[PDB]
């Protein structure tokens, strides 16, 4: 249980969608963070993987503004205090808005993976995951916008999948958080994108998984990190 309170985009801090505050305001500030209604700080599980909720979290609506970033620049995601029990991968996507991300139909967004991390060390079951690195780094995660992607407006979908109940069907807990980026400079790479509602199935190797028995390998779920980049 947690959410992204902010993002440092090419060195500039942007306040995210404060899901514990903005939903209760007469009129919340604009944010690069998408609004969403998981006001319990909860998750989308496998029962929701073909639902619109998996795209940018429960009933998500477009952030009204975007953060400019030179292609090649970094995004640092700031989470709330992530519970140690919520072991799992940290997966980050971009999708071209093909226009303004403020008015894109979230169900049209074609997500390509730009960063992924899973099981770091198996030594002491259930081991050290991306999510434990995130905790250790003051509950934050840094990714690169590839220097070679095409300039354009993109939703960056940042996600922790907690695997502590993933032993059972629909037990994995997805915590997607979307921000709006305006990528400048760049190259011409247009990686193959996947609809939010096609990213995961509840049978996937990295979704239906028992982290409490030693894993020889972990198969980070979702489409392939585009090898070009
Ligand atoms: Cu939780």
């Amino acid at each position: 249980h947690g959410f992204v309170s902010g993002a440092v985009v090419d060195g500039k801090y942007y306040t995210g969608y404060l899901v514990n505050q903005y939903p209760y305001m007469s009129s919340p500030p604009e944010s690069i963070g998408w609004s969403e209604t998981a006001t319990d700080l909860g998750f989308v599980d496998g029962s929701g993987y073909s639902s619109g909720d998996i795209i940018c979290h429960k009933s998500a609506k477009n952030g009204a503004i975007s953060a400019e970033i030179k292609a090649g620049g970094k995004v640092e995601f700031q989470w709330t205090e992530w519970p140690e029990s919520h072991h799992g991968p940290v997966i980050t996507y971009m999708a071209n808005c093909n226009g303004d991300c403020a008015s894109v139909d979230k169900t049209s967004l074609e997500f390509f993976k730009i960063d992924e991390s899973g099981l770091i060390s198996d030594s002491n079951v259930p081991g050290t995951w991306a999510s434990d690195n995130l905790i250790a780094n003051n509950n934050s995660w840094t990714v690169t916008v590839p220097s070679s992607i095409a300039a354009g407006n993109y939703v960056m979908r940042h996600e922790i999948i907690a695997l502590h109940s993933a032993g059972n069907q629909n037990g994995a807990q997805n915590y997607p958080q979307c921000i709006n980026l305006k990528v400048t400079g760049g190259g011409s790479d247009k990686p193959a994108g996947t609809l939010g509602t096609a990213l995961y199935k509840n049978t996937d190797a990295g979704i239906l998984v028992n982290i409490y028995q030693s894993l020889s390998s972990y198969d980070i779920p979702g489409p392939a990190l585009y090898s070009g980049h």
Side-chain angles (χ1 to χ4, degrees), residues 1-69 71-229:
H1 284 59
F3 71 94
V4 162
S5 58
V8 193
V9 176
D10 207 359
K12 190 191 284 170
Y13 182 98
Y14 294 83
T15 303
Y17 184 75
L18 308 188
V19 69
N20 59 353
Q21 182 184 324
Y22 294 180
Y24 309 107
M25 289 181 63
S26 162
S27 188
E30 296 185 312
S31 185
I32 73 175
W34 280 48
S35 64
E36 51 92 343
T37 65
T39 54
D40 62 352
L41 278 42
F43 54 77
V44 182
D45 71 22
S47 77
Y49 284 177
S50 62
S51 148
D53 288 354
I54 198 54
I55 298 160
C56 288
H57 221 319
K58 296 200 184 180
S59 304
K61 306 179 159 50
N62 306 50
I65 56 178
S66 66
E68 199 187 272
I69 177 161
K74 298 300 183 88
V75 178
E76 182 196 308
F77 288 98
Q78 183 60 66
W79 293 77
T80 55
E81 294 187 56
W82 189 254
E84 172 196 321
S85 60
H86 289 37
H87 298 290
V90 179
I91 311 173
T92 314
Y93 301 87
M94 290 178 76
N96 205 309
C97 297
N98 296 132
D100 295 346
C101 291
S103 45
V104 66
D105 177 350
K106 79 193 173 166
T107 67
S108 305
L109 289 168
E110 300 168 4
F111 292 102
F112 51 91
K113 201 178 284 173
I114 60 82
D115 193 89
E116 64 174 356
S117 179
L119 179 57
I120 311 303
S121 171
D122 59 14
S123 84
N124 281 312
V125 60
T128 304
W129 291 76
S131 61
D132 302 295
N133 281 8
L134 181 147
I135 292 165
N137 291 292
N138 269 351
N139 299 295
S140 78
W141 192 267
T142 299
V143 305
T144 312
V145 176
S147 47
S148 79
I149 55 167
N153 300 313
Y154 297 83
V155 171
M156 181 168 284
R157 176 185 182 286
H158 176 66
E159 181 177 39
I160 305 169
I161 311 180
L163 297 181
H164 57 284
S165 300
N168 300 318
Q169 205 176 34
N170 295 336
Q173 298 180 358
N174 295 57
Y175 301 82
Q177 301 275 270
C178 287
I179 62 172
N180 297 330
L181 297 184
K182 178 173 301 298
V183 181
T184 69
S188 52
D189 293 301
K190 299 171 298 289
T194 304
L195 299 183
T197 52
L199 287 176
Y200 309 123
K201 319 301 166 314
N202 65 14
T203 46
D204 287 347
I207 294 296
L208 186 60
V209 63
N210 182 6
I211 67 167
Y212 301 107
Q213 294 175 1
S214 288
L215 292 173
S216 59
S217 76
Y218 176 77
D219 313 317
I220 303 163
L225 180 60
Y226 169 64
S227 91
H229 291 321

